[PDB]
From a paper:
[name] is a ∼15–20 kDa protein that also has an NTF2-like fold and forms a tight heterodimeric complex with the [name] NTF2L domain.
Classically, binding of the RNA cargo has been attributed to the RRM and [name] domains because together these domains are sufficient for Homo sapiens NXF1 to bind the viral RNA CTE (constitutive transport element) sequence motif. d for the ctMex67LRR-NTF2L–[name] (RRM domain deletion) was 6.8 µM, whereas that for ctMex67RRM-[name] (NTF2L–[name] region deletion) was 5.5 µM.
Residue numbers in the entry: 196 to 223, 237 to 359
Write the structure that this text describes.
């Protein structure tokens, strides 16, 4: 199991992009199954600094995620995450993201394309407010680099 999960994580890690691709896990999801992955990624690195530098980006795209509570511990495991892809899930409104208020303080790029929350009137305004380092939301620049240097 640990061997199988470790092998899966290795196959899904792109060193060149510093990216851990956890998209579409159901095709090879559950909070306790996700917690297990997070425990394994935490155990990989003896130095948190190396972990922080190795995994700068994560995709959780296409996982039928209804609430970020489902994958909450990503915020604990990778507090210095810079890029996050949550595209192609089913996050319906801002309350489905609010469990990550005050987390991902260093996140610079966020993708929510394909989630219903993106079409609500206060979407971009609130997401900008909640994540102070965010420069790109769905490919749209929402903070200039100088703006972000001050946020």
């Amino acid at each position: 199991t640990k061997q199988k999960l470790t092998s899966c994580l290795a196959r899904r890690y792109n060193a060149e992009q510093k990216l851990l691709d956890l998209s579409a896990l159901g095709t090879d999801l559950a909070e306790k199954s996700f917690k297990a992955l997070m425990h394994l990624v935490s155990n990989e690195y003896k130095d948190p600094e190396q972990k922080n530098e190795a995994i700068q980006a994560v995709s959780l795209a296409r996982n039928d995620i209804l609430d970020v509570g489902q994958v909450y511990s990503l915020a604990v495991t990778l507090p210095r995450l810079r890029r996050l892809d949550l595209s192609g899930n089913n996050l319906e409104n801002l309350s489905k993201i609010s469990k990550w208020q005050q987390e991902f303080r260093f996140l610079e790029e966020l993708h929510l394309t394909g989630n219903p929350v993106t079409t609500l009137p206060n979407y971009a305004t609130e997401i900008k407010k909640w994540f102070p380092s965010l420069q790109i939301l769905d490919g749209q620049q929402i903070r200039t680099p100088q703006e972000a240097a001050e946020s």
